[PDB]
Symmetry: C6
Subunit: 141 residues, 6 copies
């Protein structure tokens, strides 16, 4: 079971991880690009936490945040952050809180003007291999 973190400027979570403290722990996420081209909002799901009141306020006001960084880290004895997705000029577009009394999550969508993706290859020893990075200015084409 891997760990996924999301660092949004001005909106802190309650992650107790040493390397990603006060960040949002993301249970799952998805993104889509379709054909210039159409970039869909990045949707992630997290439990209702410290960031939930601020996420609703930003969604209603529509205020921009400087940057949002999504990180996925391998589990086990090789904690490699193999994927890092950096989003610049992020807008909160959708928040869906929910809850039940039988064992609460929240679905949030992010829209951004710039995106950078970094991937790290893991070798047999579990360390870092080669890093591939691509960037694009969605707003500026």
């Amino acid at each position: 079971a891997q760990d996924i973190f999301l660092k949004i400027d001005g909106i802190n979570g309650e992650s107790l991880d040493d390397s990603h403290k006060d960040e949002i722990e993301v249970l799952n996420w998805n993104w889509e690009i379709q054909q210039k081209a159409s970039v869909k909002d990045l949707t992630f799901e997290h439990a209702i936490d410290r960031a939930s009141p601020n996420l609703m306020k930003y969604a209603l006001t529509g205020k921009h945040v400087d940057q949002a960084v999504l990180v996925m880290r391998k589990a086990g004895g090789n904690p490699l952050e193999y994927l890092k997705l950096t989003m610049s000029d992020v807008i909160i577009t959708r928040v869906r809180p929910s809850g039940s009394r039988d064992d609460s999550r929240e679905t949030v969508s992010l829209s951004f003007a710039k995106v950078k993706q970094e991937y790290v290859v893991q070798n047999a020893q579990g360390g870092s291999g080669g890093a591939v990075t691509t960037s694009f200015d969605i707003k500026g084409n």
Copy 2:
């Protein structure tokens, strides 16, 4: 298994909880906001109870109620009300009773103002930090 309560002005439930007596016990609920922005009605599910006849009449008449407060509280030995969703100028918009040979009912709420309060729980199960945000939807 946590406990969820909803306190609507003028519409009492039949909760036997000491601190939330005569409130609606909510089995599950959901809410959504989409992009100024569109605020969807808050939907909650509760068993058919004392509040059901008044919920139908308010839905049909469309009369406004002053406030509706949604509260979630943890279970176990640390009963912390970690989420409080306060809604002002609430309208009953949808009621969906159902039954089978237990019976539940789905109700939707529309409001002009919303306030959310979240309480962080520490390692001892007590209260940590409270984060509150407010927004007036009607007046933008």
Copy 3:
């Protein structure tokens, strides 16, 4: 398992219950109201019985019946009728018979006046407080 009954004027069932004889035994039912406001038809599901031929004929002809009363009663040693849904000026709008070799029927009801009665049950299983509301759907009252 609880017992659900539906009394329709001129359309008798085959229930053998002493207090609810010749009524329609309802396996399940649902109703919906949406926003003046749009009142949806009340849908109930029952096995094909004596009322089925008359329900089809009324649906085709569209003739109004005087009153339809929906009652739910708890099981066990406390047979309390905790929900009574009285509908006036009832029209049969949908009939869906079905059958399988390895049978039930779905019927929808439209009405101009609705009244709901709920009874709270105490710790002894007896009657507590009764809450009743009424509305004239066609007359907008």
Copy 4:
């Protein structure tokens, strides 16, 4: 497990039942009426059998058949035909054959007249009261 039969004039099946020989053995069926009112085609499912080639031809040609009678009979030691749905001026409107290596066919019927007969079975298992209704769908009567 009850037995369901369908007798279509000019389109014989391969049922080996003595009372319903050469009829179509219906695995399952459904019908719907909605709000003058809209009468949906009666859909029944049966295995691919002797009637399948004729059902396809009638669907393509659109020729009318005089009558189609749907019958359901209870199982056990009390073989009561408790439901008889008689359709006049029947048109074959839909045929869906299918098959797999690890076969069934779905057919829909359109008719101008409908007659439903229901027989109440008493606790012992004998015939009780019969309720019959009829309607002229094409003639609106």
Copy 5:
């Protein structure tokens, strides 16, 4: 488990059955007719085989083939071809190949101008009983 075969002129499969060699082994199939009337394309599913490259070219080119015959045969000790669906002036209208690492199938749809169905009833001994045959000219409305 029965056996289903499809014989398309000019598009051979890799069936090893002696009676139906070089035909397409159909895993499953379906057809629909709706109300003069609308005849939907016959859709069958088969594993990716020798016929797949030729099925793609006919879907892309749209060329007509003379005949396609769909046959279902019972299993056990009574191998009776109880259903035979003959289609004339057949057009390949849809090809949907797919595959997965964890076990590949392909879905193909056929459009035809004439249709002929033959059904054979099976008696208690498992042999042939009565044969019922109907034909219709879809394009000619006959």
Copy 6:
């Protein structure tokens, strides 16, 4: 369990297979043709790997790549490449990354390809498991030929 590979010019994967080194290992794929005719994009699903950053860039820029070849190879003792789908003038049209903490290292990406020329080669496998007959078909989708 068979092995599926996809070789895209300029977009390398991290396949450790000797015959298909630095290619994209495809978990599953699908393609569709409908009726001149409409050729849908070829959609394949793969784990988030070295090719993922470049697939996103080509999707956003819309730059054309020379060729993309999809290969399905039988497992067992006979590694026969029984299906080969060659696509010319390929365009990256869809990228759908996703992830979760629940499934074991859940990192799957769904990618769709648009191409102007298509070529399919199928190889029959005989009773012993060796190669049989090869069937090949080509078509110029953009040129209608």
